Design a protein around this ligand. Structure first.
Ligand code: HEM
Ligand SMILES: C[C@@H](c1ncncc1F)[C@](O)(Cn1cncn1)c1ccc(F)cc1F
Length: 449
């Protein structure tokens, strides 16, 4: 059989409307009507949703000529650049470029990354003063924007953030995209395209500076903890021998910073909100924090490794608010799920959000409650029963830096501040590509020494 279709409102538009209102309720809704697998027509596209953790093996283990990423995230191309990652000329090449990123995400570096978080948050505290209120979301994204850039690019980048408005340009790029672009890649976005060029020149300036610093200081290349992604990109070839071009290099740096920022900082936000808005949770985080700092006055990587509870909380926030609510592949060959045959051409879909709220796995799924993971080990039920970082051939290569980043930021913040949130925890806003908390998200903070 072909799977149970979802009745269209209109031909073509199909089921767009109730989907776009709320994509996640839409999938769940119709799960209950038509069970684990169903098809909906959404703006001229056949889209098949795979909803129960059981049947998601064939999805995550398929190959790039069975189930294709490149065919579905290619629209990211005005942002990332041409022939780069998902618009890169082959499966094999895409993977090679990904690795250049991940190759600046090593232990030696992660230790240097924690100084960076300290450093960046020290500056932020002056700019904030002994008390006030502030937006968590703006706050997370401001920090990460600085921490990620220094982490992946090097310290050289700072001055272009401080003296040359580099943050704004990111937004002008990162606002010039949309969940709609999926259906209409060619939609014009002239403010974005002018920024992506503006950022280009700057990254080209950055590579150009870096090339001579490898002349003036060649020892840099032996020290494994001053080797950032620019460095790896300047001294690797592809496996087949061929050099990279700067415009590939630039589109990778950019692809990594995008990855590097939006999912992280939404996750911080969701997390801190739930932590400080629940006294029992916040005791244990502070109990854990205090034991682990002991006599020590600032953070290090060992310490952050040890933060098991704060980590369960981050995870618990990812179960409830994964920022990538839909994972997608295009079928290049017909595919068999359950008793059905999902046709070639279709776009298969899996949703960490729906899974985060599937009641076989998780009990009272609407309650932030890190104990469900640490103690009732609920996530361990099914093998794909918890998927905020994907799984299989394309599982997130950023997972450990993410965790390092969110835990360092929250832990350092709680050192400095008593903080409390201001009203109900918001709902998720389905307006962006990386989903996040509806604004505003306000909190009172007061210093502590
Ligand atoms: C902080 C929360 C994060 C979440 C929830 C997240 C989530 C994901 C997910 C679900 C995927 C799978 C995509 C798919 O299968 O279609 C993925 C892939 C990826 N993520 Fe992340 N990510 C996070 C942070 C990061 C960071 C910090 C980096 C890099 C700095 C990163 C880089 C990537 C890359 C390069 C891939 C592509 C993997 C591949 O093509 O094989 N992510 N991420
Ligand atoms: C394709 C993109 C994405 N995928 C799915 N739904 C919405 C999206 F925006 C994403 O997977 C997000 N991502 C994953 N980890 C961090 N960010 C991604 C991957 C690689 C990359 F180099 C940049 C990048 F955005």
């Amino acid at each position: 059989k072909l799977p149970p279709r979802v009745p269209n409102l209109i031909p073509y538009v199909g089921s767009f409307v109730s989907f776009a209102k709320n994509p996640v309720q839409f999938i769940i809704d119709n799960s209950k009507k038509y069970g684990d697998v169903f098809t909906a027509t959404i703006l001229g596209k056949e889209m098949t949703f795979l909803n129960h953790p059981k049947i998601l093996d064939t999805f995550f283990k398929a190959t790039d000529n069975e189930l294709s990423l490149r065919d579905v995230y290619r629209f990211m191309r005005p942002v990332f650049g041409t022939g780069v990652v998902y618009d890169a000329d082959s499966t094999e090449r895409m993977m090679e470029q990904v690795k250049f990123v991940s190759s600046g995400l090593t232990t030696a570096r992660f230790r240097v990354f924690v100084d960076i978080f300290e450093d960046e948050i020290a500056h932020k505290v002056k700019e904030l003063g002994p008390e006030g209120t502030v937006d968590v979301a703006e706050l997370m994204a401001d920090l990460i924007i600085f921490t990620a850039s220094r982490c992946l690019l090097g310290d050289e980048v700072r001055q272009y953030l401080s003296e040359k408005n580099l943050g704004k340009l990111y937004h002008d790029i990162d606002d010039g995209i949309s969940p709609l672009s999926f259906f209409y890649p060619s939609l014009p976005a002239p403010k974005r395209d002018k920024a992506r060029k503006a950022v280009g020149e700057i990254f080209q300036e950055l590579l150009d500076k870096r090339r001579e610093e490898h002349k003036k200081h060649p020892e840099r290349l032996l020290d494994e903890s001053k080797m950032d992604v620019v460095d790896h990109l300047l001294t690797q070839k592809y496996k087949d021998g061929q050099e990279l071009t700067d415009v590939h290099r630039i589109g990778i740096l950019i692809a990594g910073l995008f990855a590097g920022q939006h999912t992280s900082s939404i996750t911080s936000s969701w997390t801190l909100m739930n932590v400080i808005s629940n006294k029992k949770v916040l005791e244990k985080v502070r109990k854990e924090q205090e034991e682990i700092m002991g006599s020590d006055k600032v953070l290090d990587y060992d310490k952050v490794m040890k933060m098991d509870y704060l980590e369960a909380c981050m995870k618990e926030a990812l179960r409830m608010y994964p920022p990538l609510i839909m994972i997608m592949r295009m079928a290049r060959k017909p595919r068999e799920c359950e008793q059905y045959i999902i046709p070639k051409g279709n776009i298969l879909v899996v949703s960490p959000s729906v899974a985060g709220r599937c009641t076989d796995t998780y009990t009272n799924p609407d309650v932030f409650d890190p104990e469900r993971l640490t103690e009732r080990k609920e996530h361990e039920k099914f093998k794909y029963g918890a998927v905020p970082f994907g799984a299989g051939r394309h599982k997130c290569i950023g997972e450990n830096f993410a965790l390092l980043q969110v835990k360092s930021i929250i832990s350092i913040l709680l050192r400095y501040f008593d903080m409390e949130y201001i009203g109900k925890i918001p709902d998720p806003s389905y307006t962006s590509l990386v989903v996040g908390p509806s604004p505003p998200t306000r909190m009172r903070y007061k210093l502590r020494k």
